[PDB]
């Protein structure tokens, strides 16, 4: 299926008093890069303070690769660098 | 997700327009967009399409148009310059390839 459609996700920014939830289509033929994609999704939960490194499921498993994005999960939990 | 156009219309030939077409999702840098025309009863020929790394147009329109993109509107936009008679169509926005606008009429007379 994710070689049929692009696949819709949810991504929430942690932190931020209202939290920024934002949705960005993932195309499992084009995103070679993991690295890219994370730099693409700091541009569109608009991440002032540097790209994010840590991703999350709501089950709290760390995102480290595309495989994980294009898995079970839709939705993930964003933590810039702040937090850390 | 949905694709909304606007900007189409009636131009003089020699005039320009400029298309517009806005998706209901945030739009990062990996995202397509493309543009298709479409004369009546006829398939949707490509026009232009522009991924994270090349902007690519048909012989017929290529420097007269611009595709461009402005992620943080989630939209792209389509520049027509010089436009001929010939460009008289229903242009249609396409977004991966997978999502499409309703599509827009522009008239060149």
């Known amino acids: 299926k994710d070689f049929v459609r692009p696949k819709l996700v949810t991504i929430i920014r942690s932190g931020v008093k209202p939290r920024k939830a934002v949705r960005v289509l993932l195309n499992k033929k084009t995103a070679h890069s993991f690295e890219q994609v994370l730099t693409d999704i700091t541009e569109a939960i608009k991440l002032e303070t540097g790209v994010v490194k840590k991703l999350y499921t709501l089950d709290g498993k760390q995102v480290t690769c595309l495989h994980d994005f294009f898995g079970d999960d839709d939705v993930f939990i964003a933590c810039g660098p702040e937090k850390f | 997700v949905q694709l909304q156009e606007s900007g189409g219309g009636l131009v003089q030939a020699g005039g320009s327009l400029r298309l517009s077409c806005t998706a209901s999702?945030?739009?990062?840098?990996?995202?397509?967009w493309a543009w298709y025309r479409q004369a009546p009863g006829q398939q949707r020929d490509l026009v232009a399409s522009?991924?994270?790394?090349?902007?690519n147009y048909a012989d017929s329109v290529k420097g007269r148009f611009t595709i461009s993109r402005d992620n943080a509107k989630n939209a792209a936009y389509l520049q027509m310059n010089s436009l001929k008679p010939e460009d008289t169509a229903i242009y249609f926005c396409?977004?991966?390839?997978?999502?499409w606008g309703q599509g827009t009429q522009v008239t060149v007379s």
């Open positions: 396409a977004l991966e390839n997978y999502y």
């Open positions: 999702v945030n739009i990062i840098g990996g995202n397509h």
């Open positions: 522009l991924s994270r790394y090349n902007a």
